Design an enzyme around this catalytic site. Structure first.
Site, PDB file in Angstrom:
ATOM      1  N   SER A  45      22.705   7.435  11.539  1.00 28.63           N
ATOM      2  CA  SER A  45      21.729   7.684  12.590  1.00 28.63           C
ATOM      3  C   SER A  45      22.241   7.463  14.004  1.00 28.63           C
ATOM      4  CB  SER A  45      20.433   6.866  12.396  1.00 28.63           C
ATOM      5  OG  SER A  45      19.575   7.464  11.440  1.00 28.63           O
ATOM      6  N   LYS A  48      21.858  10.447  16.292  1.00 28.16           N
ATOM      7  CA  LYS A  48      20.617  10.776  16.985  1.00 28.16           C
ATOM      8  C   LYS A  48      20.794  10.715  18.497  1.00 28.16           C
ATOM      9  CE  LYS A  48      17.330   9.414  13.313  1.00 28.16           C
ATOM     10  NZ  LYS A  48      18.244   9.739  12.229  1.00 28.16           N
ATOM     11  N   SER A 105      14.380   5.418  14.408  1.00 28.62           N
ATOM     12  CA  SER A 105      15.313   6.010  13.458  1.00 28.62           C
ATOM     13  C   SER A 105      14.617   6.964  12.498  1.00 28.62           C
ATOM     14  CB  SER A 105      16.182   4.969  12.742  1.00 28.62           C
ATOM     15  OG  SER A 105      17.489   5.530  12.602  1.00 28.62           O
ATOM     16  N   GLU A 141      19.461  15.637   8.208  1.00 21.34           N
ATOM     17  CA  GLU A 141      18.982  14.488   7.441  1.00 21.34           C
ATOM     18  C   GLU A 141      18.344  14.987   6.148  1.00 21.34           C
ATOM     19  OE1 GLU A 141      19.703  11.211  10.201  1.00 21.34           O
ATOM     20  OE2 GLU A 141      19.363  11.433   8.030  1.00 21.34           O
ATOM     21  N   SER A 212      22.773   3.512   9.401  1.00 15.61           N
ATOM     22  CA  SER A 212      23.034   2.994   8.079  1.00 15.61           C
ATOM     23  C   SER A 212      23.087   4.169   7.112  1.00 15.61           C
ATOM     24  CB  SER A 212      21.911   2.052   7.646  1.00 15.61           C
ATOM     25  OG  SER A 212      20.704   2.684   7.429  1.00 15.61           O
TER      26      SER A 212
HETATM   27  K   LIG Z   1      17.309   6.456   9.940  1.00 11.81           K
END
Ligand SMILES: [K+]
Length: 263
Positions: A45, A48, A105, A141, A212
């Site tokens: 992440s 992002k 997240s 994702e 993560s």
């Molecule tokens: K995430």
């Protein structure tokens, strides 16, 4: 050469059993401290930040872009999306999606940012436009978190990401108002207190984005405003040999403490 700080990071890494990557830029003197600084790591992440920044760059030529609504449908939900699931069968604006991605997240929110940019390659294209030849986003994702050792997909290096985070947050990769918005978002992150932040004096202000994924991948990228001195940019990436390994945010905190003690 191997510095005392580098030697300490190597000892931390040996005790962890994993692979640690660190890049510090001290923006007072522009000096850098690298550990495995040119090795690739899965971003998870932390990517992002690049996607939100690419949308902020689009918004410089469209005053209303950040208020544009995006439909959230049930099939858009992926594995971790606490904000987006509340708006299923409704809408979120691109600002709301950026805030949710960065501060919570939210993975559905990231997928909407990626789609706004024309797919993963639109995020990579923005990276190239701001001088980052290393970053690559290849998937959406949740599959961008597979974090398989040796897989180049969805990776960057610590050196490249620190340089880019500096340009985005402290430099001129974005317009003034957009830079300030990115900084505000990062400073309001909810997920960071166990990671870089935990290794630093509590008086210092931090804006960060964690990540993560599989292989116990545990990451954080931060801007840091120490009391009394110019800001720092710090990247800490960590990944482990076992697909099912547990997260190790404490390793990131330990790396940050070693860096702070070295200043
Ligand atoms: K995430």
């Amino acid at each position: 050469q191997t510095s005392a700080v580098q030697q300490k990071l190597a000892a931390l890494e040996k005790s962890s059993g994993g692979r640690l990557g660190v890049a510090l830029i001290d923006t007072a003197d522009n000096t850098q401290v690298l550990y495995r600084g040119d090795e690739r790591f899965p971003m998870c992440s932390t990517s992002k930040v690049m996607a939100a920044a690419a949308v902020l760059k689009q918004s410089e030529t469209q005053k209303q872009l950040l208020n544009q609504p995006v439909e959230i449908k049930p099939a858009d939900l992926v594995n971790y999306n606490p904000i987006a699931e509340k708006h299923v069968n409704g809408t979120m604006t691109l600002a709301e999606l950026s805030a949710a991605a960065l501060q919570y997240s939210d993975n559905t929110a990231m997928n909407k940012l990626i789609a706004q940019l024309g797919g993963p390659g639109g995020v990579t294209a923005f990276a190239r436009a701001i001088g980052d030849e290393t970053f690559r986003l290849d998937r959406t994702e949740p599959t961008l978190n597979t974090a398989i050792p040796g897989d180049p997909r969805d990776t960057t290096t610590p050196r490249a990401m620190a340089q880019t985070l500096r340009q985005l947050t402290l430099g001129h990769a974005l317009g003034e108002t957009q830079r300030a918005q990115l900084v505000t978002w990062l400073k309001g992150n909810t997920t960071g207190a166990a990671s870089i932040r935990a290794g630093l004096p509590t008086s210092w202000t931090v804006g960060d984005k964690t990540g993560s994924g599989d292989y116990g991948t545990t990451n954080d990228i931060a801007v840091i405003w120490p009391q009394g001195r110019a800001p720092l940019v710090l990247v800490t990436y960590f990944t482990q040999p076992q697909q099912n390994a547990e997260s190790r945010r404490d390793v990131l905190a330990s790396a940050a403490r070693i860096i702070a003690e070295g200043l």
